[PDB]
Amino acid sequence: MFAGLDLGSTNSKLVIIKEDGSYTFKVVPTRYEPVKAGELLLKNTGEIRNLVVTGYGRVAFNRGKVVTEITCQARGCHELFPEVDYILDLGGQDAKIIKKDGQGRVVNFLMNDKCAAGTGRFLEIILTAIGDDYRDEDLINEENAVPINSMCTVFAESEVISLLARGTSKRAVIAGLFKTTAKRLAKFAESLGKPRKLIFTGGGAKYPALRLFLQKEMGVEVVVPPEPSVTAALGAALIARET
Amino acid sequence: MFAGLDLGSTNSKLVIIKEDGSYTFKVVPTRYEPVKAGELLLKNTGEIRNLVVTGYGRVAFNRGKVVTEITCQARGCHELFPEVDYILDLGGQDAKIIKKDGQGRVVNFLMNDKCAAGTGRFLEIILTAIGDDYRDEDLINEENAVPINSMCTVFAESEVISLLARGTSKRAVIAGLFKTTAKRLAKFAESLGKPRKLIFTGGGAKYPALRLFLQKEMGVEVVVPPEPSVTAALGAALIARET
Amino acid sequence: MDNRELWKVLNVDLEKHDEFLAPVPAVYRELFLNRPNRPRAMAYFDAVVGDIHGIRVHELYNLKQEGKKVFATFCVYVPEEIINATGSACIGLCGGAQYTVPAGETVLPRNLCPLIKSAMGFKIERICPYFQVADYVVGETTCDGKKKAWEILNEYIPVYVMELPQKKEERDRKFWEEEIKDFAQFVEEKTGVKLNAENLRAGIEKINKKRKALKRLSDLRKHNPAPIHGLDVLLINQLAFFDDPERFATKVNELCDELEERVAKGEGVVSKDAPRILITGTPQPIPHWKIHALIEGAGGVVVGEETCIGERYFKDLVEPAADVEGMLKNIAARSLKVNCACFTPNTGRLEDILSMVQKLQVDGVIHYSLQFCQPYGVESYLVGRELERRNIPFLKLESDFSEEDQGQLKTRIEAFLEMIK
Amino acid sequence: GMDNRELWKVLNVDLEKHDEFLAPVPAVYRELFLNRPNRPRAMAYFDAVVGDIHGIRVHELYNLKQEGKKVFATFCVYVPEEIINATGSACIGLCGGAQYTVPAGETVLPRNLCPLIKSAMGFKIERICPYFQVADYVVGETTCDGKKKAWEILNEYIPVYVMELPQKKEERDRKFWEEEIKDFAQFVEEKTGVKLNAENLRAGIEKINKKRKALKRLSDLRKHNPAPIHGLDVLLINQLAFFDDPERFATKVNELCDELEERVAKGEGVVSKDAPRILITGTPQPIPHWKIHALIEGAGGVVVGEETCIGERYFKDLVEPAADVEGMLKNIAARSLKVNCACFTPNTGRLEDILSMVQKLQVDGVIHYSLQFCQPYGVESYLVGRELERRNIPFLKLESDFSEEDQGQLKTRIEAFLEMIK
Ligand SMILES: Nc1ncnc2c1ncn2[C@@H]1O[C@H](COP(=O)(O)OP(=O)(O)NP(=O)(O)O)[C@@H](O)[C@H]1O
Ligand SMILES: Nc1ncnc2c1ncn2[C@@H]1O[C@H](COP(=O)(O)OP(=O)(O)NP(=O)(O)O)[C@@H](O)[C@H]1O
Ligand code: SF4
Ligand SMILES: [Mg+2]
Ligand SMILES: [Mg+2]
């Protein structure tokens, strides 16, 4: 009866909290149509007492109370990790580092610059194209991960083309892509202060090689929600309950 | 008898010229493996006297004489349009403007800058995501082609996301993408001098709306080969024969 | 028709000029005219925008018919006082439109500040009647992109390049005084008007009166509830660069009179729980309204601008002197008080930011700099870090003149407003 | 091995990151240099420098400091090496050339900034460079926007003295720079405790003049047909000029020139006489930024000159002697102001330099290469290309960063150019 709806650039997520405190979640692709995805998500749900909508599609949805994904992500990660002060959210279009206090309140945040947009969607695109059917154990076991340009997805695509055109191993390229992404994310995740411990969430945290490369670059403990896709929507549902 | 192999970033092409001067052509997706694509094209092709290899994959292909796609595109288009001096080749990763002389030799050329890489592939991806179900001529007359950032595909993707997230029509975004691309390509195609007429080739020239928007922006006739995918490969085959 | 005849005489590309001006009225409608609670005294400035390429361009053209000159400038350091002493006109032409960026890119890198690309493109395309009526450009050695672009622009219109130093020690202050003396001789030569105590004091008084009026408007924004939206003040500060200084100062002062009435009744344009925002960074030339419009569209109110279309332009007034030599020294000193990031170090700017946060009762600072502006882009690191040490909320934004990244900017701005509420 | 590792320890190098940085260098050097045939025997000295690039020279600098001397790090050819060397202190140029350190530099710098700046900042922040770790001071300069504003940040990690270079070369500017040189001389005296006098300043001038003269001698030999040395080898030598002992370096350069004179006298070279001769112009290529030369010469061209500050702009101009310190300082200032960097306006002398080099070196094409987001050289490339095309000089504009894997894009552009000018 308390719903949180996260209409992201790539996927839309619905979390519903029952009176008992338990919760369920639903995830569907956004398909560049946030309104339709959210309506598909909310049908057959039963009647909802309060809704909070977040994500790129939040305004167009024209329902419920609108809250940015920065505030929602902080609220949802605090429910799961009240003792960790820093959150890294990698989505399909934006990357976010958030600092929160003991009560879950955002005390500082930063999002990617313009040239750093779209990293997650690029990784999704390139993995299907290259063909990713080795396990991550192969990727971390790769001794010749190729450094790939960290500037942006344009320069990185140009290098992937050059590398594969020359006959470089797809595993060396894929390993290099995760490794360079992890290196950039580690420096980004220290923007608000050097964390002693880091929460890594968003669909980006579902890549096993990226989690491991990130933890190695960070040099500190990393924790990942049970379901990183939905922690922002859970935060919205907790806000919906509290208000 | 004489073969030209164009191992492009997205597609690979083979033209075989016979002794009579006739020629046949074949296209396959490169799938990031130009060695495999080249051997596939050459399967069952008979006894080749000379082979020229061009495109990204020429660096890896272990036989044939290597020639850049600038020189080959000039020679191939000269066979079709000896009267037109300027060639715009829009591929998946690079854009090329070429000025040729009366023998199809390169007089000057320019390729896209680093931030302009990947325009072709970006159009392919975005059309797959949002645009298959639209008439071509409904784009030409669309009254609200939205301006989209001309900087690079990262910035454009960011704007496409915001535009569709606030409910802008798919067709208005597609028209805006094509119009903005035509405007950048018009300035690009004047880089070597103002053409009295322009050959528009490569796979990018197969978008009919792009050609018409380009022609309107440039104010001169834009001619497209009957098969723009294979004109560089034809150039390679003619150089193979001439050597 | 009278406008269209003037543009033809100025050799404007009429079709492109029409295409450029086509979307403007609707944007102004959306962001200004249809916005409620605007002071009645905005009507004058709305009228200026309404005929932005008419009345004023006519006045400039008629000035040239009498033998006066039109100097175009791109930086607050160029001494408006000396030009106006001679009766000639000074207009600031920094670019703020995406329409002309591709034209600028025919001769400039694409990875360059869009202010520069847009300005160059205006001249190349012959889109801008102000640029077409200008006799000279007065450039300055500030950022790399401007300094090197002047070498290219000189092929289209004569460019006089003033050499600004890069520090503010005594040797630098003397150097700049000598540059101002050389520039004065150039204006005298081009106008045929010799500076004397009388006409230079008059030039100083005219520009000082313009700056003082903008200082008065800036001070009134310290009141809560804010008596005027920041988007309207940005527009006024933008028009300061090419309106007639006497008429402009009069209309700004009339606006201030009306804002004083609002304050006396505790009337404002926002609730008083709305977050009050200071913008700091690069100038936002007309019509680059995006950032203010998004902040205030999200429920905030911008109460000041630490930029050169903003506080850096009008804060410092010329002190009087008895003779021409003393006045030129004081004109040079006035401009060198401007704390631009092209100077090193630029500690004065940080002091200005902190002072503005206190006086304007600011809840959060948005540092906005144009993409590829390296002086302000690099300096943003030390600014943000010091505001961190002082527990001042801080958000760094960058963008260009394209409009459709609003979705990205909105989420950053709205998350910031949520955080500081 | 062990002895180097203890030195890096004392210098507080991050040993693990340092190993990761150096790990791929030997393979690149093997592919681009050691496996390339027909290199002069006298390249052995420089190959051995690269093989111990963080060893013997860093030991020498550490030992100088233990004697009470100082190590000054510089990033611009305008800083007067002559004044530093007069005191017996060392001057090392640390312009960054490595992608490895760029993400670290981006923790405090914008990502849309020149990679030279980002890479050098990252070396300092990460404690990855033994030379940056042994340096006592950085001498900065008010050249490009990125460097100028980066010095304010770098000063938190290492003291930075900023010299104010003017932006024009009129008389007022020349006098201004003379005063900046005198101020810098006083700073050097204060930090070293060594007063400049006629004897030691003349000796410092002679030592740096001798180094520049050796590189001028090497550059002149590249005018011969066939080219007697590949340009990539000369770039390496010009890069190492910024770190090596000036007297040893000049001796080894002159020994190379003696060998090359023997090649010239027998008509031996590294290419056929029909191979296209290429002039590079633009930004400096700091070590190990070898990509552009490697691609040109791997495509069968030969680079016969570099109009850059790791190249002709560094060594072209020598200090004129004078009898007293006041006159030597004015002549040191005048030498550096002969450098035609794009940070000056106008910079018409650089175009004239380019056109002169095209004739002196009998160049078949000019490749203008500048680093991404270098606005001084990026903007100026328009007027350069326009004049060269007016004079029917083949011209190719290239831009890149330190990331090595845009090879295919650059290769097509370079090879299409060589095909065109053949
Ligand atoms: N198996 C997978 N399939 C698809 N995407 C995956 C997968 N594993 C990881 N991902 C990543 O998950 C990302 C999407 O994460 P998500 O958090 O849902 O983004 P979003 O919230 O929709 N977009 P944003 O607006 O930037 O916050 C993709 O871009 C991929 O990089
Ligand atoms: N129906 C279509 N299907 C796919 N691509 C299409 C289609 N119509 C047009 N295109 C465009 O054709 C482009 C590919 O052209 P092509 O000339 O084959 O590139 P390429 O030679 O492989 N790459 P490059 O290395 O940059 O020269 C794609 O990027 C699309 O934008
Ligand atoms: S191509 Fe990359 S570096 Fe260039 S503007 Fe786009 S995101 Fe930035
Ligand atoms: Mg998300
Ligand atoms: Mg192709």
Ligand SMILES: [N+]
């Ligand atoms: N012609």
Ligand SMILES: [N+]
């Ligand atoms: N003109």
Ligand SMILES: [N+]
């Ligand atoms: N001083």
Ligand SMILES: [N+]
């Ligand atoms: N060899």
Ligand SMILES: [N+]
């Ligand atoms: N002078």
